[PDB]
């Protein structure tokens, strides 16, 4: 069976090579480059006693949520810096958090293999407990459905009102670290500790395509605004842009001065800029088309753990291990 | 405005939470399955001389532990339990200790090393490593046990000098002085952290 697998792998590689006639860099040679982008810190949010592990912007572009090591899930009002909510967790090993699109529910989870869902109307409303490994990322499809990825090499689609695993996605050979939902909310992607990202159909429940060009574990993933591409960041100090229709890697964002992996990846509203949070205590803003570093965001005393971009693209929120969350404009 | 009042109340609650959080010492318990880590996620909270210790033992995830270990970066110490009786699996424990010591995110965490089941080792010695033949016991208190201790200390002092320390201990299955040793090691770790801060290291 191994020989057949190698045969289809060679056929896939040959088809991909034949399909690729030009390169993105060659096409993006006659366009004007983005000028030196210098984004300044407008707000800083304090109150977390320990390192911040994840964050998620609200769909109203104003409120956000952040989870820290001290077992605290704090919901901030970004505009006035005033704190809105503070939820204590049963376990202080939270690795991810999420904000419901309607703004009524907030989910988190971690080393306890439990996806806790709190109702903001703050009492815990549901505990989804079906995973075998740590839960690494959870995203909200609706107030009744959620998609999670665990460290047991599986993803899941849960129905919240019942508490059961409606669908399970298998195929990863390593711990799944991050996932991103397409804007159509019908397809999504998952990056694992396997140097391979995969595309899952939510309704069908079967993997459509697998993109493997990386060299080490993938720590973060984000989806292009138009829904036909996505960028992944890994531990080999590189970011990569993959295209859905061509099913091949398009551009590689890296410089010969970085020896640290990427812990967070996000796009701008128009997709022209790609923001990558690094373990070197700073973030980099790349030109997503010219593959040239257009700017650097510095000011964190520890590694940037989470990075997000506002829905309307008016701000970028970065949370690092320095127990501080900074908003850049 | 009521929002500012709510923010002030939450800030006071967070100050109280910081006050309680800073007084609890968190420890991570690691070791192989054969090593008697239980006898020394399951969370065990104990109290030594009015000091609160909280030890977490993680055994619910898979064997790939290069990703969830990073969640224990700010832990006070790693209590590493080694079954010194079993010679066959000793090299596996040595590899685990070396990987823990040389890790980038755990390069500033001290290791309290317990060498469990000394009675079994003593029984086995009285009626794998070729280097044991050309070995002599040091001028310490009261040969195989000290050889294993030196084998661990070789890796301990091979790298990371001045950043963290390894504290060996010889523990039996019915030894009740483990809490005192953990408290003393934590006290020395706090003293070292204070010294490093005071010299701007």
């Amino acid at each position, epitope marked *: 069976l191994r020989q057949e697998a190698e045969q289809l792998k060679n056929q896939i590689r040959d088809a991909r090579k034949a399909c690729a006639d030009a390169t993105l860099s060659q096409i993006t040679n006659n366009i004007d480059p983005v000028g030196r982008i210098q984004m300044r810190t407008r707000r800083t949010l304090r109150g977390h006693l320990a390192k911040i592990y994840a964050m998620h912007w609200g769909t109203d572009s104003r409120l956000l949520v952040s989870a820290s090591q001290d077992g605290k899930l704090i919901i901030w009002d970004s505009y006035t810096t005033n704190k809105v909510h503070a939820i204590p967790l049963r376990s202080s090993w939270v690795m991810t958090c999420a904000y419901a699109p309607s703004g009524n529910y907030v989910a988190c989870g971690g080393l306890d293999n439990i996806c806790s869902i709190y109702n903001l109307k703050v009492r815990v409303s549901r505990e989804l407990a079906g995973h075998t490994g740590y839960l690494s990322c959870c995203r909200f499809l609706d107030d009744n459905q959620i998609v999670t990825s665990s460290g047991d090499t599986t993803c899941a689609l849960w129905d919240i009102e019942t508490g059961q695993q409606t669908t399970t996605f298998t195929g990863h050979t390593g711990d799944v670290m991050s996932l991103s939902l397409a804007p159509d909310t019908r397809l999504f992607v998952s990056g694992a500790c396997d140097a391979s990202a995969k595309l899952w159909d939510v309704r069908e429940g079967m993997c459509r395509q697998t993109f493997t060009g990386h060299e080490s574990d993938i720590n973060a993933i984000c989806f292009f605004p138009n829904g036909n591409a996505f960028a992944t960041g890994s531990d080999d100090a590189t970011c990569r842009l993959f295209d859905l229709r061509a099913d091949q890697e398009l551009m590689t964002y890296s410089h010969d001065n970085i020896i640290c992996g990427i812990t967070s990846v996000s796009f701008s509203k128009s997709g022209r800029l790609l923001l990558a949070g690094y373990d070197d205590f700073n973030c980099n803003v790349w030109d997503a088309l010219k593959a040239d570093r257009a700017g650097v965001l510095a000011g964190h005393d520890n590694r940037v753990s989470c990075l997000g971009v506002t829905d309307d693209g008016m701000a970028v929120a970065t949370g690092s291990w320095d127990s501080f969350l900074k908003i850049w404009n | 405005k009521a929002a500012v009042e709510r923010s002030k109340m939450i800030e006071k609650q967070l100050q109280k939470d910081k006050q309680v959080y800073r007084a609890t010492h968190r420890l991570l318990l690691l070791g192989a399955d054969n090593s008697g880590k239980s006898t020394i996620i399951f969370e065990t909270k104990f109290q030594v001389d009015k000091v609160n210790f909280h030890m977490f033992d993680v055994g619910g995830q898979r064997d790939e532990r290069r990703k969830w270990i990073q969640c224990f970066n700010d832990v006070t110490a790693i209590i590493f339990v080694v079954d010194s009786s079993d010679y066959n699996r000793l090299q596996e424990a040595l590899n685990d200790f070396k990987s823990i010591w040389n890790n*980038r995110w755990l390069r500033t965490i001290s290791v309290i090393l317990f060498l469990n089941k000394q009675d079994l080792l003593a029984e086995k010695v009285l009626a794998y490593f070729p280097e044991f033949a050309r070995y002599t016991t040091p001028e310490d208190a009261t040969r195989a046990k000290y050889f294993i201790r030196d084998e661990f200390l070789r890796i301990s002092t091979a790298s990371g000098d001045g950043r963290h320390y390894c504290y060996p201990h010889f523990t039996c299955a019915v030894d009740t002085e483990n809490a005192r040793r953990i408290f003393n090691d934590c006290k020395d770790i706090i003293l070292q952290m204070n010294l490093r801060e005071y010299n701007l290291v």
Partner: nanobody
Amino acid sequence: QVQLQESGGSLRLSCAASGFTFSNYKMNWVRQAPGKGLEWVSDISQSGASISYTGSVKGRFTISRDNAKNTLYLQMNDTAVYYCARCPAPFTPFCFDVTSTTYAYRGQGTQVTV
């Protein structure tokens, strides 16, 4: 695609690597004896620096790496299935999950019978 193809099976076991920059990772040779679990055997750094061997093979085995040809050699002179494994991340002097049941960056391995 991270590919590690092993060959061979005194012996001169070889491991050819492709899909990544070879001279950037710390490599290990691992074995699995029949009826037992995975056991680490040998380890070499990324530049021919300090080399580690398990207690039972010290001196008796040799391990080299040809960075120009992107290959890893293990010269031996027990019966087991051998694999060549890579450190998960580059520029790092430690391998964490090499001796694991399911490792993503480990080759197929070759049988050696004595």
